[PDB]
Structures are given as structure tokens and as C-alpha cells.
RNA sequence: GCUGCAGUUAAAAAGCUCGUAGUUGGAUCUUGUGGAGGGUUCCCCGCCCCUUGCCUCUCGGCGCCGGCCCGAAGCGUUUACUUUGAAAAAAU
């Protein structure tokens, strides 16, 4: 957040989940980033860089992660037509 | 005629009187006159694509419009070779009205018929321009820069009377209203 | 999938699939299930695709290769059926086992010695091991299981649909999970037969 | 509801086969018939739902018993649509 | 929902979209209107002369085979009744509850059900004498049921 | 009945994205409710939303995400005179630097940030932050 | 408690329905381009049919070379609303 110089303020900028669009707190302990591990997609084998992910408590607690996670794959790989 | 068979219009132009002469022949040629009973037109016009090509526009009077649809094709057909490299369409032309309520000024003349506003005669023109796919469905969107696009589909038999006049379609509709349309089959047919 | 062929599902796993059953599913159904189900019989069961197991396996087996310390991918299960597959599991591919009654508060403790921080689970059927479940929305654990169509999805992040009332099911989808984890992070890779075989994660089976 | 699901597109017959005005577009769910039935050698049409008794200029004189629905014929033949 | 019932229930028709002729039919506008005007003669009423074309005849429907409406070519010729059959049927119900309640005064269920045929009746009057479709200086009584009903 | 037609069509926004949603299906298509989604959009609320048509009144089908609290309605519909402003804003917003305030004035439906700009007063609506 | 209350159990929805006054009431009847003021399309003249809707004219000015052109005169079916003026004793 910006200022009369523009200077940043804000002790931390929070970080905004994938598939709802909210912010998590500083106290909300059902929200985890997943690991998706990326391959060089020539051989199928582990290259490096991951994809991560971030998911909140709301969503996951009605269960309705087991969508967002297969969308975002969908969007991008490891999923085809599924 | 040959030169006031286009009244309303303003009788001479080199183009819609080359159009008319020819036209109004063939309805009196003996080849085909069991279907043509010598009608006219009120006007005609040329306009083209981003595809690089013209297409014909014939406007009537519109109550003779009727009588035209009867036969549609085989006549379509026959001018599409007679003036060949260009498509071929018909139209109707009304006199749209401004409201009442107010755009021009009113002298409580008459009511203002709802088939004689302007947005009735812009549905009606869409329902010729493609009028052997008789409209399924309309759908809209709307742009985030305040634009729209209609969606319109069609039915899903009498696909190719239709496939390759499909974008050239579009393009005259474009020149009449002055929006953007995008001409679709769906996903399924009831 | 991915990968044009070179990951995609081969003509011999599909014998072992259906020798083992997975393919079947139970009668009861959930609104988190109805994709992976492609129809029903003309009789009580429903027909989960292979195709749609198979695609879930490969990001699901990615997110435990995902991780850059293996001991701390710890798998539980509490079903007896359960019990033998997830042992060899984590012996053969480093990881920590919970066999058998979980003992609440051990991802959640500092007084007790069974205490641990993991950063994944992988759990066999939601209904019999409820209890880690609740306890991973403390400390932020992802979480990864074998669903099948009558167990709900709640507090689970992916899903890896499976026939799993007690089978050969069970067996042959930890031997298939541990397979695909050492393609890509282990040397095993070749992809044309590999020594060890779903033949010893099956149930122990009482003997005569 | 997973809650996420699409409303544009629906499925031909899983997602059109919900109650007709709460589809999008509505609909009928009935249909008329081209019918030539052999004691009235004529080329009749007929709606699904009768509604009442249709007559017959032949040997017989009824072609349809109306009921709570699609009215049953009594010995006719021969089922068009045709399109709608 | 219900107006004098506590119910809600759906059963409406739904027409479609479309609206062509559609292509298979017969019968131009003019054969429509000879077709309907033989069928008012035998007292059969508006809604019913829309019923016996639309289930035997190739009609979908009197709107769109012509411009107007089933009861407008009817009042064109200025054969149309003095009353709407609407109007004349809640009349037609409401006296045959008088004479049972004649009969029997022990009915007041009967008695129960007739406050609201009857106050039905003036709502509906109310709407049509404003609009200048009846007289305004007529008014429903049990002397004036027995006279127009008849 | 239905007595009031764009207030019955906010409820159903403000519901569907606190369970989270990003489709939805609004009925009976007014277009006071397209004019008002219009500069909606142009802020960034909701995205591009599609209009189906049926001769009934139509139907509309919105996307939309997260960046979106709440849109309210207020009714019946006051006037505003340019210095009763100040008071409804304060107590209609979360804070003076962000939020909008909606009105129809005779220059055409807008926010409020843009009537002070053209001197127009007329009759509140709603608002939504 | 209009802004701003409450009525399952704490004080509290007429036993139930009909019904006039009162209050409240669905959808639907116009958009793009050069100049000017502000961006990179978009918000005082005009153009597609409309553009402050018309005429009819005649009396008293402006024109141009008897003849011709355009301001003022009736008004756009009626109101609410909103915006600008006028007119508002002092003291407080």
C-alpha cells in the first residue's frame, strides 16, 4: 500500500489463494501451499522447478479442493481431457 | 421499369439501374415467369467484407417482401451466376421513427406503433439476412470496454444454404445497424 | 497425460486393474463423486473410469516427489487390509508408517514422544482414519488419500479413487503409488519390469 | 453442487432433462404426429396430448382415448414428429 | 399462489422459441378464419375453438397462421357474446350452490365456498367495467345471476 | 409479485460468492440491473457477463471473483441534493477512500464520483464496495 | 429504535378466513463517425432516418446580387425529481 511518496507500508503483504480469491491470516492454520513437482516431459523425469499452489481453510473444509487443485492442473500439466 | 422502379431512393445511379434492368428482364424472359410476377424494388447497394469481396443488396417495398421469400433460392441462385462474384442477399427497408418520448419533437400526431420503433427492425432485419435457418437461439456478451457481441444460433439442418454466405452476413449487418454479430451452430438441436 | 507416451497408461496395467477389480465401486455414491463414476450397471455398482484414476495417481505421486527430504512423508493407515501394503511402502521408499490405532494429539503435542512434523499425509479410506484428518487443519499438513465412491471428501486436498472395501484393490494401488515415485526421482526408470511386484503388499490372509 | 459448476453449455440430456421452464430456454415436451391408420385411409395429424377424441371419416369413428397425459390410440399406426 | 386456496403448483405452458409456421402446414390465414367461424355457431366458446384446432387440425396454434388473436377475429364480425365466458362461468357455478343451499341449509361448507366464488365475482367485475368493456351502472345481485346466466 | 426486481438480484450475487462461485443465473433480466452491472465492471467487481435471450424478460449469466464483499441495495429511492451527500456516504461505505455509491441522475446512471463532476443530483439506488 | 430495536422459550403474532379504504406492484419503446474541450475509442454543430420538433407567415432589422436566406411569434401529451436564477427584517 502506497503513501505521498508511494512508500510501502504494511508489515507483510498477505498471500491470495488460487481458487477463491481471498487473503489468509496471520491465525488460520487449514491453509497449505502444495508442491506439484514438474518432469522435462521427455523422459518423465523430475526436472527442477515446481509449481506451487495455495489453497484457504473455507474450501477445503467443505471439500471442495479436490476440484480447484484438478482445475488448476487442467489449466496447465499434468492433465489432459480427464 | 428500368429507372423508376426505384422510387424514394433517387432514380438515377449508373449501379442500382444496371441491377434493375437485367433484374426486371429475367421476371419477364417466358424461362422463368411461373413464379415471377414482375415485382420491383425501392432501392439496391453495394457493400463489401474484410474478406476482399462485394456483396448485392436488394431492398423492396415491404409488402411485396412476402412474395419474395416464396421462391428465394432458385431466383438467389440464378443472380448469383447472372452477376457472378458477388453474393447475394434480399432486405427489407421501414421507416424507423424517432420517440415521441423524445428525440424529435411530437405534435401527438399518432401513438408510435412498437413494430415501427427502431430496436423491432433491427430483430426483423436479422430474421431475412438468414432466414432459411429460421433463428433457434440469441445470446449476447457484453465487452469489458462496453462493446457486445451477439451470439446467434441457428439450426443445425440447412447448414451449407448458409456455410459459405456465413461470415459475408455478418458484414452487412455491420454497414445497416452499425454492431458486431458472430454467426454460430450449437452444440445440439431441439 | 503430460508427456505424450512416455507416462501414459500401457496395455499391461490394464490386466492388473481389472484382475484386482479397482474398476468396481461400491453402491452408494457422493456429489464429489459423481465425475469419477462414468455409469452404473444394470444392477447395483457403479463403474469408475481408469482413466480418470490413472491421471490422479501421476500429480498425486509428483507432490511426494515434490518434497527434498524423504522421511518425513508420513503414510498411515489402520485397516488390517492396510496395514502390510503401507509397510512396505515406506520401507522400500523413505518414509515414515503409523500402522495400526493413530493415538490423538501427535501432530499436535510437545510433551509427547511420538511427535512429529511431517509436510504430506497419505491415508487409505477417510472412514477408518478420521482422526489425522481433523488434526492435519491444525499445522497445515497437505493431504492425499484413496477415496471410493461412498467416502466423502473433507479436509483432503487430491484424491485417488479406488475399488478399496478390502481387496487386492488395496495392495496394488500402494505397489503401483511407490512404482511411479522412483521414474522419476530414482534410477529404477527404464519403465519395463521392475523386481519387486504387487505380490507381497496384499493382505496377510490367515494361512492354513 | 461441486460449486463451480458451468451454466452456459448445458448437456444434451443429463442437463435437458430438468423441468421445462426451468431450463434456459423453454421448451415443449410434446410433439404432433403424422398418422395413417388402417381404417381411415387418410393422412391425419394429431397432437400428442389429445385432450379429446379424435374422429375418423372411415369404418371407425375414434383414433385416440385421451387420459392424464399422451393420449393412447386404439389400434393407430405410424409416429412422426416431424422436427418438433 | 392460489388466490382463495393456500396451494402454489406449477403447470403452465411453455411455448418455444421459435415461431416460423413451422414450414409443414396448411390452410392460409383465410381458411383458418372460415374454419373457426362454423364452430362459434355451435356455441363452441374461445378456448374451446383454440382446443379442437390445435388437437386434430395443423394448426400450433391461432397466432402465428394469423395477426390476431382467436377472440378478435371473433368481435371483427361483431359475433362476439356480451360478456367474457370467464366472467359467465363463475355466474354459471355460483347458482347451482344457491339451489343446494336451498335445499340443504345444514351445508356450510357449501355456504363457506360461495363468500369466495362470490367475492371472485366482484374482483373480476371491477377489472372490466373500468376499462370500459361493461356499463358502468351494473352490478351483480342473486336477480341479475338468474337473468344473464340464462 | 416481485415487487422490486434489482433487489431481489443482489442477494443472489452476494450469496453465491461467499460459498464460492463463479457462475450464476439471475432472473428476470432488467435493464436497470445491466446499466448497473456496467459500471460495475468497469472498476473491477465482476468480469464480462452474458446476456441470454428469451421473450420473457431474458436471463443473465455473470463471472465474477473474490474482489467483491457485498453489493447491497437501498430502497425506496431518496433524493440527493449534493450535500446531503456527504451524509449517506459515510454511513453506506467502509472508508471515504474506496467505494461507490450508485444513482440515477437525468445525465444517465453513473456513480457518485462522477455526478459531483457534473453537478447532478437524482435518486440513489445502492451501492457496493 | 426514520437513521436504528424486538415478538419459539425472557414482556409479545388477532382461533381462522374473506374484504373496502390505506400502502405496495413484472418485463418491453435508439447506436456509431470529422471540428471543438479531456484520454487513446469515450463525455458544443452537425451527419445515415433524427438532432434543440415545425411552420407561416407578417409586421418593425441583418445580410448578398426585383429576387433570395436566417434570429424573434405559437410549442413539442402532462407531473414528480434534479440543476440555475429571482425574491427573501434586524439582532442571534
Known sequence: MQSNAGEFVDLYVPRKCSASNRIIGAKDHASIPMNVAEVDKVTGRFNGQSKTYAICGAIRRMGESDDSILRLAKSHGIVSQN | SAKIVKPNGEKPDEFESGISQALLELEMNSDLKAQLRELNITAAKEIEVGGGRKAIIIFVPVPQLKSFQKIQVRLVRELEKKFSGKHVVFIAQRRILPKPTRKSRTKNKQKRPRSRTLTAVHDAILEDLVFPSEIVGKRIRVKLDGSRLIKVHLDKAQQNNVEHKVETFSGVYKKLTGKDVNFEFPEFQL | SGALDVLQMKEEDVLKFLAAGTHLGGTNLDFQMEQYIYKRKSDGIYIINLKRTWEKLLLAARAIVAIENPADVSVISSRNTGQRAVLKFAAATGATPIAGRFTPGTFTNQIQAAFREPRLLVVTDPRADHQPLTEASYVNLPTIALCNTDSPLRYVDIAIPCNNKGAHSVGLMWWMLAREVLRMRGTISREHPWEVMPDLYFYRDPEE | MPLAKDLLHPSPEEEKRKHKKKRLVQSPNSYFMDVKCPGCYKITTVFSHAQTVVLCVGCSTVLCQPTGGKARLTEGCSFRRKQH | ?150 | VRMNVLADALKSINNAEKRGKRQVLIRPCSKVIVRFLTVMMKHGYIGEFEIIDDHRAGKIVVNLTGRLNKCGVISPRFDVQLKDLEKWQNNLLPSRQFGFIVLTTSAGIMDHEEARRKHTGGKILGFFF
Open chain 5, 1 to 150: 399462489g392460489r388466490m382463495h386456496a393456500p396451494g402454489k403448483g406449477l403447470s403452465q405452458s411453455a411455448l418455444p422459441y421459435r415461431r416460423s409456421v413451422p414450414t409443414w402446414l396448411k390452410l392460409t390465414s383465410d381458411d383458418v378464419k372460415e374454419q373457426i367461424y362454423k364452430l362459434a355457431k355451435k356455441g363452441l366458446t374461445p378456448s374451446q375453438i383454440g382446443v379442437i384446432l390445435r388437437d386434430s387440425h395443423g394448426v400450433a396454434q391461432v397466432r402465428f397462421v394469423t395477426g390476431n388473436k382467436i377472440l378478435r377475429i371473433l368481435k371483427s364480425k361483431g359475433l362476439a357474446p356480451d360478456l367474457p365466458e370467464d366472467l359467465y362461468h363463475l355466474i354459471k357455478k355460483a347458482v347451482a350452490v344457491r339451489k343446494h343451499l336451498e335445499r340443504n341449509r345444514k351445508d356450510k361448507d357449501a355456504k363457506f365456498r360461495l363468500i369466495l366464488i362470490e367475492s371472485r365475482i366482484h374482483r373480476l367485475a371491477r377489472y372490466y367495467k373500468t376499462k370500459r368493456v361493461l356499463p358502468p351502472n351494473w352490478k351483480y345481485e342473486s336477480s341479475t345471476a338468474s337473468a344473464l346466466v340464462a
